[PDB]
């Protein structure tokens, strides 16, 4: 099932009963987690306009509130809706490093509460956050759903259609390979991988990203 907004700006696509991918327009992906305690997003959107519209679309459809968002790094595609989160009382989780970079770049601060490995539970939905090391950015994290074996790779992970690394001005191209290897070691059985941008794949996306780094 795939549901679009008023224009084609915002699309949501069901992965399973409780997990959707959100995509906004260059495209950008996140998750929507439909939990018994509320909706949880992995990642916001480009700006406050799109973030508000995403929150409203999912609140209406799932008939519950967005309670929490996990921010996967401090660039605009991820943190651009932070103002909106804070003024609506939506908790914005991040690592300390992501928060510090957010503040350095003039954005409102997320919580800085995530560690190298953090295990969260929202109602019945388990969510693990993992900092694998530097790659696309210094601060990039991935998100793992152990009940579905679904990995949210973020911009650390490139889609099949991606033919180069994209924006590397903030990247660590020597360390990015070790970081991907750390993900592959930690999560040996992956059902789906959601890249930061592009189509959902599997572990092949991590192997593709390694090849792009050669």
> Which residues are annotated binding-site positions for Zn(2+)?
73, 75, 77, 136, 155, 197
**Two tokens, residue 145:** 């759903």
The DSSP symbol for 147 reads T
Q: Show the CA angle centred on residue 157, arms to residues 70 and 46, nearest 5°.
A: 50
Binding positions for Zn ion, rule: CB under 5 A: 75, 77, 155, 196
Helix and strand tally (H, E) in the chain?
6, 12
Annotated active-site residue 170? The verdict is no
Closest distance to Zn ion from the beta carbon of 136 (Å): 6
Catalytic residue, chosen from 73, 93, 140, 208, is: 73
Annotated active-site residue 208? The verdict is no
Closest distance to Zn ion from the beta carbon of 159 (Å): 11
For CA atoms 45, 134, 137, 153, the dihedral sign is negative
Interstrand relation of 150-154 and 192-195 (parallel, antiparallel or unpaired): parallel
Residue list for the binding site for substrate? 158, 167
Closest distance to Zn ion from the beta carbon of 13 (Å): 18
Q: Which is nearer to Zn ion, 38 or 195 (CB)?
A: 195
Catalytic residue, chosen from 43, 68, 77, 139, is: 77
Catalytic residue, chosen from 75, 93, 139, 208, is: 75
Catalytic residue, chosen from 124, 167, 174, 202, is: 167
Annotated active-site residue 164? The verdict is no
Dist. CA 68–CA 108, nearest whole Å: 16
Annotated active-site residue 167? The verdict is yes
Alpha carbon separation from 32 to 62, 170, 198 (Å, rounded): 10, 27, 16
φ and ψ at residue 32, rounded to 5 degrees: -120, 120
Contacts of 167 (CB under 8 A, 6+ apart): none
Closest distance to Zn ion from the beta carbon of 121 (Å): 27
Residue (of 187, 213, 43, 162) closest to 203 by Cα position: 187
Give the catalytic positions in this structure: 73, 75, 77, 136, 167
């Amino acid at each position: 099932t795939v549901i679009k907004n008023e224009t084609g700006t915002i699309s949501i696509s069901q992965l399973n009963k409780n997990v959707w991918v959100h995509t906004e327009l260059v495209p950008s992906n996140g998750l929507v987690l439909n939990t018994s305690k509320g909706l949880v997003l992995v990642d916001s959107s480009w700006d406050d306009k799109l973030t508000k519209e995403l929150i409203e679309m999912v609140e209406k459809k799932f008939q519950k509130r967005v309670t929490d968002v996990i921010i996967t790094h401090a660039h605009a595609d991820r943190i651009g809706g932070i103002k909106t989160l804070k003024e609506r009382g939506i908790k914005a989780h991040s690592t300390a490093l992501t928060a510090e970079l957010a503040k350095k770049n003039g954005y409102e601060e997320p919580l800085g509460d995530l560690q190298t490995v953090t295990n969260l539970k929202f109602g019945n939905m388990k969510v693990e956050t993992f900092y694998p090391g530097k790659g696309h950015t210094e601060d990039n994290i991935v998100v793992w759903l152990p009940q579905y074996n679904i990995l949210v790779g973020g911009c650390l992970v490139k889609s099949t259609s991606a033919k180069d690394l994209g924006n590397v001005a903030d990247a660590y191209v020597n360390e990015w390979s070790t970081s991907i290897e750390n993900v592959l070691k930690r999560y040996r059985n992956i059902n789906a991988v959601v890249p930061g941008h592009g189509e959902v794949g599997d572990k092949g996306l991590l192997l593709h990203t390694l090849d792009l780094l050669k």
